[PDB]
Amino acid sequence: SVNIVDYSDCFEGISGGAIFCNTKNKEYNIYNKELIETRRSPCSTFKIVSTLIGLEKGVINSKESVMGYDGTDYPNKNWNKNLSLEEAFKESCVWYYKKLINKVDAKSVQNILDDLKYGNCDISEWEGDLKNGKGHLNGFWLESSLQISPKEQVQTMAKIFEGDTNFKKEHINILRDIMAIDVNDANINVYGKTGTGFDEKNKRVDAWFVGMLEREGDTYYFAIKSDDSNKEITGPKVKEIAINIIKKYYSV
Numbered sequence: 146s147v148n149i150v151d152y153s154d155c156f157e158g159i160s161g162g163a164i165f166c167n168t169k170n171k172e173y174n175i176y177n178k179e180l181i182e183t184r185r186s187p188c189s190t191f192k193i194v195s196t197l198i199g200l201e202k203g204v205i206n207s208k209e210s211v212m213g214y215d216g217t218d219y220p221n222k223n224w225n226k227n228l229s230l231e232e233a234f235k236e237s238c239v240w241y242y243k244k245l246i247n248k249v250d251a252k253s254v255q256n257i258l259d260d261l262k263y264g265n266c267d268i269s270e271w272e273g274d275l276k277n278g279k280g281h282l283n284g285f286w287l288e289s290s291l292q293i294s295p296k297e298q299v300q301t302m303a304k305i306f307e308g309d310t311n312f313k314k315e316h317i318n319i320l321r322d323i324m325a326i327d328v329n330d331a332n333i334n335v336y337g338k339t340g341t342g343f344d345e346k347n348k349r350v351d352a353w354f355v356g357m358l359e360r361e362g363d364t365y366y367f368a369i370k371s372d373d374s375n376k377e378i379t380g381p382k383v384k385e386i387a388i389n390i391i392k393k394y395y396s397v
């Protein structure tokens with residue numbers, strides 16, 4: 146049952162949409178359908194999938210795993226160290242995940258995205274959007290060739306976390322561990338990942354919060370996405386919108 150809902154009150158005037166889906170039943174809750182079906186760059190929400198890829202290929206092994214920091218200077222102080230998978234994920238550290246993915250052959254990534262039905266599965270622009278001048282701080286998942294809709298994000302999440310892929314449960318559980326977020330509410334478990342990008346073509350943000358909600362035996366897989374024209378609208382902002390929706394509409 147697809148129910149069209151209105152979560153405009155939690156968006157505080159920001160343009161976007163949301164999709165929550167419970168697979169135990171078939172409750173699909175959709176705010177702004179056109180947007181929910183529209184493919185965009187996943188941005189850093191792809192770090193959910195790239196983490197599983199690195200674990201599956203044995204590039205990394207646990208939430209402590211390191212990628213061999215070489216001392217390069219970065220403006221974010223937390224990038225300037227041999228950080229663990231948990232920290233790189235939570236800091237959304239780009240050099241860590243770029244080095245990780247560049248240890249995997251492209252055909253393995255193609256096959257994994259295909260299996261996950263990950264949007265357009267287009268990794269043709271492997272090095273990413275080089276015209277932004279950022280060089281090696283780029284990749285196919287950052288405002289580049291790969292694109293996925295909020296609906297497909299939710300479907301991918303459900304496939305992964307319901308056990309419907311060949312990824313090892315041990316690796317799934319590492320992801321659950323590092324995806325958990327503190328929502329000041331112990332009656333629900335919230336997991337997710339932000340993403341932030343700007344579509345220079347359309348002059349709109351791609352701001353994401355994608356994840357899952359556990360609330361008394363029921364699990365909801367969700368994706369919240371803004372396409373606002375205001376450049377101040379980021380992943381973290383959209384995560385706050387997501388948390389407001391969860392507290393207002395997915396409590397009990």
Ligand SMILES: *C(=O)[C@@H](NC(=O)/C(=N/OC)c1csc(N)n1)[C@@H]1N=C(C(=O)O)C(=C)CS1
Binds near residue numbers: 381
């Ligand atoms: C993933 O989406 C990352 N975003 C970027 O690569 C950006 N790089 O440019 C500085 C970016 C930041 S603002 C903008 N228009 N582009 C990392 N993920 C976000 C996130 O998690 O939402 C961050 C919090 C840090 S950057």
